[PDB]
Amino acid sequence: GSRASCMQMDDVIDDIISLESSYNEEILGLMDPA
Amino acid sequence: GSATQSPGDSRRLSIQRAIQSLVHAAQCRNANCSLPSCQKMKRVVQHTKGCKRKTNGGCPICKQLIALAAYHAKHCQENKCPVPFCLNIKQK
Ligand SMILES: [Zn+2]
Ligand SMILES: [Zn+2]
Ligand SMILES: [Zn+2]
Protein backbone atom coordinates (compact mmCIF):
# COMPACT_ATOMS: atom_id res chain seq x y z
CA GLY A 1 0.00 0.00 0.00
CA SER A 2 0.90 3.68 -0.04
CA ARG A 3 3.58 4.20 2.62
CA ALA A 4 2.30 7.75 3.12
CA SER A 5 0.01 6.23 5.77
CA CYS A 6 2.93 6.12 8.23
CA MET A 7 3.55 9.84 7.77
CA GLN A 8 0.06 11.21 8.39
CA MET A 9 -1.28 13.33 11.24
CA ASP A 10 -1.77 11.24 14.36
CA ASP A 11 -5.25 11.76 15.77
CA VAL A 12 -4.00 10.09 18.93
CA ILE A 13 -1.21 12.58 19.59
CA ASP A 14 -3.46 15.57 18.94
CA ASP A 15 -5.82 13.91 21.39
CA ILE A 16 -3.07 13.78 24.03
CA ILE A 17 -2.51 17.55 23.92
CA SER A 18 -6.25 18.14 24.11
CA LEU A 19 -6.51 15.74 27.07
CA GLU A 20 -3.54 17.47 28.73
CA SER A 21 -5.52 20.69 28.45
CA SER A 22 -8.99 19.44 29.34
CA TYR A 23 -9.05 15.70 30.07
CA ASN A 24 -12.53 16.08 31.52
CA GLU A 25 -12.80 19.60 32.82
CA GLU A 26 -16.60 19.23 32.77
CA ILE A 27 -16.49 17.52 36.18
CA LEU A 28 -13.87 19.97 37.43
CA GLY A 29 -15.84 23.15 36.89
CA LEU A 30 -12.77 24.88 38.27
CA MET A 31 -13.27 28.55 39.02
CA ASP A 32 -10.75 31.11 40.23
CA PRO A 33 -12.57 33.30 42.78
CA ALA A 34 -10.36 36.36 42.45
CA GLY B 1 -5.17 33.56 39.62
CA SER B 2 -2.36 31.04 39.05
CA ALA B 3 -3.55 29.82 35.65
CA THR B 4 -6.53 30.73 33.48
CA GLN B 5 -6.08 27.44 31.62
CA SER B 6 -5.68 23.90 32.91
CA PRO B 7 -1.99 22.89 32.79
CA GLY B 8 -0.92 19.42 31.76
CA ASP B 9 1.17 19.26 34.92
CA SER B 10 -1.83 19.28 37.22
CA ARG B 11 -4.11 17.18 35.02
CA ARG B 12 -1.32 14.61 34.83
CA LEU B 13 -1.11 13.94 38.55
CA SER B 14 -4.86 14.48 38.86
CA ILE B 15 -5.44 11.63 36.41
CA GLN B 16 -2.78 9.41 38.03
CA ARG B 17 -4.47 9.71 41.43
CA ALA B 18 -7.80 8.87 39.86
CA ILE B 19 -6.16 6.02 37.99
CA GLN B 20 -4.95 4.51 41.27
CA SER B 21 -8.61 4.40 42.21
CA LEU B 22 -9.71 3.09 38.82
CA VAL B 23 -7.14 0.31 38.42
CA HIS B 24 -7.79 -0.95 41.95
CA ALA B 25 -11.62 -0.63 41.97
CA ALA B 26 -11.81 -2.24 38.53
CA GLN B 27 -10.47 -5.62 39.65
CA CYS B 28 -10.93 -5.38 43.41
CA ARG B 29 -13.05 -8.32 44.53
CA ASN B 30 -12.43 -7.62 48.21
CA ALA B 31 -15.76 -6.84 49.80
CA ASN B 32 -13.98 -5.93 53.02
CA CYS B 33 -12.12 -3.24 51.05
CA SER B 34 -12.57 0.12 52.75
CA LEU B 35 -9.89 2.39 51.32
CA PRO B 36 -10.49 6.11 50.37
CA SER B 37 -11.45 6.09 46.65
CA CYS B 38 -11.86 2.40 45.50
CA GLN B 39 -15.35 2.14 47.02
CA LYS B 40 -16.64 5.17 45.13
CA MET B 41 -14.57 4.47 42.05
CA LYS B 42 -16.04 0.97 42.19
CA ARG B 43 -19.51 2.37 41.49
CA VAL B 44 -17.82 4.35 38.73
CA VAL B 45 -16.48 1.18 37.07
CA GLN B 46 -19.88 -0.31 37.86
CA HIS B 47 -21.50 2.74 36.24
CA THR B 48 -19.97 1.92 32.88
CA LYS B 49 -21.49 -1.60 33.08
CA GLY B 50 -24.74 -0.51 31.47
CA CYS B 51 -23.79 2.77 29.88
CA LYS B 52 -25.61 3.72 26.71
CA ARG B 53 -25.84 7.38 27.74
CA LYS B 54 -22.13 7.84 27.01
CA THR B 55 -22.63 7.60 23.24
CA ASN B 56 -24.85 10.68 23.56
CA GLY B 57 -22.15 12.46 25.52
CA GLY B 58 -24.09 12.12 28.75
CA CYS B 59 -21.31 10.28 30.57
CA PRO B 60 -18.80 12.61 32.32
CA ILE B 61 -17.63 9.54 34.16
CA CYS B 62 -17.05 7.42 31.06
CA LYS B 63 -15.43 10.63 29.76
CA GLN B 64 -13.08 10.30 32.74
CA LEU B 65 -12.36 6.62 32.26
CA ILE B 66 -11.73 7.37 28.60
CA ALA B 67 -9.61 10.35 29.73
CA LEU B 68 -7.50 8.39 32.19
CA ALA B 69 -7.46 5.00 30.46
CA ALA B 70 -6.23 6.56 27.23
CA TYR B 71 -3.34 8.00 29.21
CA HIS B 72 -2.95 4.76 31.14
CA ALA B 73 -3.04 2.75 27.90
CA LYS B 74 -0.33 4.99 26.45
CA HIS B 75 2.01 2.62 28.23
CA CYS B 76 -0.13 -0.48 27.76
CA GLN B 77 0.53 -3.14 25.15
CA GLU B 78 -1.45 -5.81 26.96
CA ASN B 79 -4.77 -7.08 25.64
CA LYS B 80 -6.01 -7.64 29.18
CA CYS B 81 -5.87 -4.80 31.68
CA PRO B 82 -7.51 -3.84 35.01
CA VAL B 83 -9.46 -0.66 34.21
CA PRO B 84 -12.46 -0.87 31.85
CA PHE B 85 -11.73 1.64 29.10
CA CYS B 86 -8.12 0.55 28.58
CA LEU B 87 -9.32 -2.43 26.61
CA ASN B 88 -11.71 -0.03 24.88
CA ILE B 89 -8.68 1.91 23.61
CA LYS B 90 -7.28 -1.38 22.33
CA GLN B 91 -10.50 -1.93 20.36
CA LYS B 92 -9.24 0.62 17.84
ZN1 LIG C 1 -10.53 -2.01 46.72
ZN1 LIG D 1 -20.96 5.92 31.71
ZN1 LIG E 1 -3.95 -0.61 30.60
Swiss-Prot record, chain A:
Deubiquitinated by USP13, preventing its degradation. It is found in: Nucleus; Cytoplasm; Lysosome membrane. Expressed in melanocytes (at protein level). It is linked to Waardenburg syndrome 2A: WS2 is a genetically heterogeneous, autosomal dominant disorder characterized by sensorineural deafness, pigmentary disturbances, and absence of dystopia canthorum. The frequency of deafness is higher in WS2 than in WS1. The leucine zipper region is part of a larger coiled coil. Belongs to the MiT/TFE family. Homodimer or heterodimer; dimerization is mediated via the coiled coil region. Efficient DNA binding requires dimerization with another bHLH protein. Binds DNA in the form of homodimer or heterodimer with either TFE3, TFEB or TFEC. Interacts with small GTPases Rag (RagA/RRAGA, RagB/RRAGB, RagC/RRAGC and/or RagD/RRAGD); promoting its recruitment to lysosomal membrane in the presence of nutrients. Interacts with KARS1. Identified in a complex with HINT1 and CTNNB1. Interacts with VSX2. Transcription factor that acts as a master regulator of melanocyte survival and differentiation as well as melanosome biogenesis. Binds to M-boxes (5'-TCATGTG-3') and symmetrical DNA sequences (E-boxes) (5'-CACGTG-3') found in the promoter of pigmentation genes, such as tyrosinase (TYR). Involved in the cellular response to amino acid availability by acting downstream of MTOR: in the presence of nutrients, MITF phosphorylation by MTOR promotes its inactivation. Upon starvation or lysosomal stress, inhibition of MTOR induces MITF dephosphorylation, resulting in transcription factor activity. This is Microphthalmia-associated transcription factor. It comes from Homo sapiens (Human). The chain holds residues 216 to 248 of 526 of the full protein.
Swiss-Prot record, chain B:
A zinc finger (TAZ-type) spans 8-89. Acetylated on Lys at up to 17 positions by intermolecular autocatalysis. The modification Phosphoserine is found at residue 6. It is found in: Cytoplasm; Nucleus; Chromosome. It is linked to Defects in EP300 may play a role in epithelial cancer. Interacts with HIF1A; the interaction is stimulated in response to hypoxia and inhibited by CITED2. Probably part of a complex with HIF1A and CREBBP. Interacts (via N-terminus) with TFAP2A (via N-terminus); the interaction requires CITED2. Interacts (via CH1 domain) with CITED2 (via C-terminus). Interacts with CITED1 (unphosphorylated form preferentially and via C-terminus). Interacts with ESR1; the interaction is estrogen-dependent and enhanced by CITED1. Interacts with HIPK2. The CRD1 domain (cell cycle regulatory domain 1) mediates transcriptional repression of a subset of p300 responsive genes; it can be de-repressed by CDKN1A/p21WAF1 at least at some promoters. It contains sumoylation and acetylation sites and the same lysine residues may be targeted for the respective modifications. It is proposed that deacetylation by SIRT1 allows sumoylation leading to suppressed activity. Functions as a histone acetyltransferase and regulates transcription via chromatin remodeling. Acetylates all four core histones in nucleosomes. Histone acetylation gives an epigenetic tag for transcriptional activation. Mediates acetylation of histone H3 at 'Lys-122' (H3K122ac), a modification that localizes at the surface of the histone octamer and stimulates transcription, possibly by promoting nucleosome instability. Mediates acetylation of histone H3 at 'Lys-18' and 'Lys-27' (H3K18ac and H3K27ac, respectively). This is Histone acetyltransferase p300. It comes from Homo sapiens (Human). The lineage of its organism: Eukaryota, Metazoa, Chordata, Craniata, Vertebrata. The chain holds residues 1723 to 1812 of 2414 of the full protein.
